[PDB]
Design a protein around this ligand. Structure first.
Ligand SMILES: CCC(CC)O[C@@H]1C=C(C(=O)O)C[C@H](N)[C@H]1NC(C)=O
Lengths: 385, 385, 385, 385
């Protein structure tokens, strides 16, 4: 039975720890994969951590990591949440160096992009069997979310970008059913920059908060209806979401240029005019992580908010973070659970090692209360190398 | 179908071995988690061993174990009974440094506490999805059973403590249905100290034998109806069940203060006025274990009992122990099976290693006869370190 | 639905290879249990390999193996046929240093004996939960088949022995259902000696071909009905099946003393007055294996037989072997498929290592023709130790 | 419900990446089997990777590899597609130094041949249980596909060879039902040489394109109906498909002798008079790989073709490749989906190590577009040896 996306984000007051895989600590001795962007996505029955791997284990020569980001050895795989991703507990999903995945309530749709930078191609797989293909339309690094795609009413959607990671690039939103692109639209988003979008369903529409790697310290967003009729803008909140960024001053609804000329995959959840923002604690490094509730900051420009829930201390590394959803059909709830996962990145380039991998921690919505704390990766570097 | 807890504990003459995971021996080379409190719990179909990990494997630098007991890496996981807990074979359950779990006939209820000591939050999950949150109400290390909770008529129950592990603390009994607290009661138990409760259902009610870390050598207990109407007291037998403890002299039905101002998670099974006391063989160390049947001993003070069955020889190390039950819905029996597990602690503080982990063995009730013997951990220490 | 054991053994011409796990060779690097007696047994749906482990892995110090045969760490487990037994693919069955198992069409019956030599106890489990217990009745190493028991008409049967491994011992046949011993009989077998029986159903009855460790070079047998009314004897064939043994001279229908004073778990299939005998090739060691078809040989004394199918060369080590059965409920055949398995033992006492473990190979019945060959263990000893 | 093979090959334009296991890169630390000929075959629900192993893991002394190809330790196993084959994730299929496998829509049929060169025997299994045997009829290395067999309307087919791998050999086609040979036919192919056939169903008929190890640079083929009524020939195209082979000149419909006096296992898909040809890029080594579409090149001789899609750069190693198929009962499509896998051989004889193993990559049919690229093994040799 197809996942209805008609309900709304549940009302929350904080975030409860949902999972911590300790991959890198476990991986010191265990056969753990060296990985990146470990995003979570759920079905009507279970939740899985997807991730991309260079096809190498921690503490092996092959973790050498000097390799180009986009190698032909990169693969999308998944394992059950909270488990250290190893070759013994991971299901192969697709060959790719950028990807997303989501479940329509019936089957898994995975989207693995691979090939050369000037002709990369996205392979879509419904229940593991290739169902469609998408080719680079700009011949300049076709790439996608690196987190869950969103499904509604039997249709799933994703955002892909092709073009420079500096100036303008091209952005298309795709609508697919049973792994087949039935429709697609190129956003008319001049002066906007979209990368690694974190999308989620809400009352039959999709919202995505993304990364602006070109020229914005705040994050750009796009929300569209099942017919790909959209709207775009930037979280106006002066609690800037991107990293690097400037100190929290006065925000704006289009690209904040001071310091926002790079970035990190992140997310944000829109509540009315308010925003729950996840972000690194540091303004320079992918260190620390905190959730911030700025009621009415999605439209207003302030530096003030009302709640801050710590997640990872500034003294410990973080990295990519993205959002994921639990549908009522999995929960029994009468709303959609917003949840998020954080990538705790270790090694290069901030640490003196030959490799780079990450741990995940994830949290979920919830009305009852929570607490802030620090759930860092916890590995002692460097490794036997 | 919900688990009816209306039958009573099955009459028993002794305890037959049920399982032994050999985790620490296998861990010498295998990828086994370093763990603590591997309690067992069963559903209407199978039994699983739950345990807590620091997220490190045996024989690996990260099992350094100089970390605070309650680190943010401690996680609750489970694997089939008798298997070595490894990331290749364990299911992630929850992020926690204290917890319990129990199945109600439908799904697993897991309860994992994490967070700082001045406001730990218990996250309750039903079938893997968060269903409730309980906050510390004293802001002083909120903690729970470290063993199977008890379900009856579709409602599950547990006991949590908040406050000091020395003097008076606050104790509450929780009642939840489908992972949600539907009723809670604070016990009016001045002079009492409850910690790491071993609870079990009997005839529609729950009886818990716990640990008094404050000032008792005998174990305190609580029993309660499905409406949290309760009774409390201490095991009066002069066969003191805690550890440390004094030599078996004359008990009392309120905390025996000679020598019992510390302790160890243990259990006991009440039959009528008698008791099966599980406890260590030594009175100073967590070494050896034995089962003891002091009939007319739960209400009476003596030193005399009728049976003693050896489990682990004074010469070997033991540790936490807890009860678990096997319901007729799993068993086919017309009564509830009393079972228990014993944690075989190796390493620190009694050995000269840099870690602490434990193996597990369990036994079940039984009418037929058994044999006393010694099923110790069996690992050679130290390890390659 | 209960396995009907009413059909007869299928007629056969030779044995086709069924499996080979390579455990020891794989075990040089992989995490493989050091095991003994990996007998195979099947249900109505799958076949599984059971085996006993010392709770240790190949190439780790704990395989030190100087440990008594009967240690409290010994456990009964199982993994799918053909797979190397590791703590990552094996199910835990029971704590045991002697064992047997068999499926009745509904659930698995396992029997694991543990405890001291003067009072061992056999734990029976039906679907993993304890259903009965049997204590030593001579207080001298209660012990069992180390191979599949036999089920017919929803009752399973096994043979246990208690008493010395030299002179007269005591022999009992247990009839159990749903894992509960519903009847037992002590064989009245003066001058007989039964250990490690390999039993199989045929035409509603059970026949077991065992090992005489006391004074026989020929194998003793027992066959009984569902009411435990039995008959007994020795394979009369001069193609002596035990090991050690003399050169094939003239056999006798009661113990052949010469050279018959020790032995190895073996099996044999009776077909009318003929026997399919499996035995080692050497007469002083456990090396080589061959299936021999001596028609008119179970009741006659000859040295002559019609067929010999090599299985393991004399230049390679073998060990225990036993029979396991297919039933027409798992096969679709109108008869019972006789199969067998052979244990390839490497290490001590024949080899200069610190451990002993074995690999497994299996073959089945089959009407079509096969080929004799040699399927040895294939590991290079000694190991990294 | 049995798999109908009544539909035609789906029309296609190129090949989308389906999987990459990186087994070598991973085996560098992880416990992965050293394998050869990892063919893929699918059921109506999943696709698995079958491979053959020597019973040894990478980076362990048992991969020493000086061993005859045809050892008694060689086994057929399978694991999900895209996963690294390890004893922890692979299922045991059969003892075999040559094999094939296919699912008939109901259960899997595996064909494993083992035994000595003068009289090997193909053991057939249906759903894990032996269902027939086929003995060498020339006593000179009976051998089969090393790739998926073809199933149609409930009958599966395979091709085996017996005889010299130089001069005339003997070649037979077999039709089986429920793993039982129901009909076989010897090809009347004087001057032809068939080995390691890649077969596939098309419109209720099977087509196989094989290896001529005797005196052919082009590949020989056999197509047959459900009654084993057949036809034979060679791919006439001057786009020589074997390796070694000469530079692409003018070919012939009968064995091209220039340089095709050895070879490598391969495939091609027939569409009308056209042919999709999968082949290595070098004419001397098993290096690189590419798909070429030579329309009107299955019946014609040219050096001209229309499309060339790269799969592995000339600069990297490659190996066996085979066709597998996806049926409509699995895909939902209305036609049979052609796919292929490529074996990426590392080590001996081309590199300086003591072992030989292969990774795998695979691609499927597809109407949308794709891209040529290189997806090499990526392992750094030599290993710690
Ligand atoms: C014996 C003929 C056959 C083709 C030449 O040899 C194959 C060549 C191989 C090869 O050249 O890659 C390896 C195969 N595993 C082998 N199979 C057998 C049956 O031994």
């Amino acid at each position: 039975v197809k996942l209805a996306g008609n309900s709304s984000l549940c009302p929350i007051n904080g975030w409860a720890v949902y999972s911590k895989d300790n991959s890198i600590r476990i991986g010191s001795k265990g056969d753990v994969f060296v990985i990146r962007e470990p995003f979570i996505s759920c079905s009507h029955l279970e939740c899985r951590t997807f991730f991309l791997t260079q096809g190498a284990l921690l503490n092996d020569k092959h973790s050498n990591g000097t390799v180009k980001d986009r190698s032909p050895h990169r693969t999308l795989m998944s394992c059950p949440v909270g488990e250290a991703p190893s070759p013994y507990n991971s299901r192969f999903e697709s060959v790719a160096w950028s990807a997303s995945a989501c479940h329509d309530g019936t089957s898994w749709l995975t989207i693995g992009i691979s090939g050369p930078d000037n002709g990369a191609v996205a392979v879509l797989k419904y229940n593991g069997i290739i169902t469609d293909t998408i080719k680079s339309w700009r011949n300049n690094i076709l790439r996608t979310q690196e987190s869950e795609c969103a499904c509604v009413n039997g249709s799933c959607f994703t955002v892909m970008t092709d073009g420079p990671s500096n100036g303008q690039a091209s952005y298309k939103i795709f609508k697919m059913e049973k792994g087949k692109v039935v429709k697609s639209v190129e956003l008319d988003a001049p002066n906007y920059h979209y990368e690694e979008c974190s999308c989620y369903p809400n009352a039959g529409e999709i919202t995505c908060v993304c990364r602006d790697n070109w020229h914005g310290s705040n994050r750009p967003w796009v929300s569209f209806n099942q017919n790909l009729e959209y709207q775009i803008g930037y979280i106006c909140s002066g609690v800037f979401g991107d990293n690097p960024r400037p100190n929290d001053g006065t925000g704006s609804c289009g690209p904040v240029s001071s310091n926002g000329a790079y970035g990190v995959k992140g997310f944000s959840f829109k509540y009315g005019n308010g925003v729950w923002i996840g972000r690194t604690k540091s303004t320079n490094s992918r260190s620390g992580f905190e959730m911030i509730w700025d009621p009415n900051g999605w439209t207003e420009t302030d530096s003030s908010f009302s709640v801050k829930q710590d997640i990872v201390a500034i003294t410990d590394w973080s990295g990519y973070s993205g959002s994921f959803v639990q549908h009522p059909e999995l929960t029994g709830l009468d709303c959609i659970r917003p949840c998020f996962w954080v990538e705790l990145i270790r090694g290069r380039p901030k640490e003196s090692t030959i490799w780079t991998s990450g741990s995940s921690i994830s949290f979920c919505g919830v009305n009852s209360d929570t607490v802030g704390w620090s759930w860092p990766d916890g590995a002692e570097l460097p490794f036997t190398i």
